[PDB]
Amino acid sequence: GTKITFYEDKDFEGRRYDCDCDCADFHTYLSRCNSIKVEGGTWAVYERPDFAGYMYILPEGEYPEYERWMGLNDRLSSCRAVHLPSGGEYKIQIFEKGDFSGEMYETTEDCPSIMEEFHMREIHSCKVLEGVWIFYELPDYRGRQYLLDKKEYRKPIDWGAASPAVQSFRRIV
């Protein structure tokens, strides 16, 4: 019973498209997205069809301009609802090299700068043992966003990234 509404202009103006289930392609219904209203739960929204391109994670709320979801442009074309467990334990394993190789670290806590904490600038694979997490390109949860809502990620492309650069990560609660 969650819903997301996309508006072409800022401040919830202009033509609109709404999604109540997952939508793999609404680029023919909206030329651009400059504000969003999210109801009922948390959504992942994507620049290109079929959940491709830049992605952004939006909790319930009102977003009058794309900066409010750290958007890179006003282009969105697909979206899916994020299923969050009832606030249990959260646990993630990050790896120095692809395919779960190299050095590994396991944590239960948000990390606003992984260099100071794990002495890595990059994460080349990961296993999400419990919970749902977000990787960020820059420290303090800034820059590009990548949703980790599955279990195993063998290489960065599996979380939608072109490179293993990750500098912070946190749980979705």
The H-assigned helical ranges of 7-163 are 114-118
Strand partners, 61: 38
CA distance linking residue 153 with residue 173, whole number of Å = 21
Burial class (CB in 10 A: 0-12, 13-18, 19+), 73: exposed
Please state, in angstroms and rounded to a whole number, the distance separating the CA atoms of residues 66 and 145. 14
Identify the helix (H) or strand (E) that includes residue 130. Answer: strand 125-130
Taking 3-state DSSP, the helix, strand and coil percentages for the chain, each rounded to the nearest 5, stand at 10, 45, 45
**Which among 87, 91, 89, 159 has a CA at the least distance from the CA of 123?**
159
Q: Which of 129, 132, 167, 166 is nearest to 147 (CA)?
A: 132
CA–CA dist 76, 53 (Å, integer) = 9
Task: Give the bridge partners for 133, in sequence order.
Answer: 148, 171
Quote the DSSP letter at residue 117. H
Q: Are 108 and 90 in contact (CB under 8 A)?
A: yes
Rounded to whole angstroms, the Cα distance separating 140 from 168 reads 6
Is 103 exposed, middle or buried, given 0-12, 13-18 or 19+ CB atoms closer than 10 A? Answer: exposed
Within 10 Å of residue 111's Cβ, how many Cβ atoms? 23
Experimental method: X-ray
Q: How far apart are CA 116 and CA 30, in angstroms?
A: 43
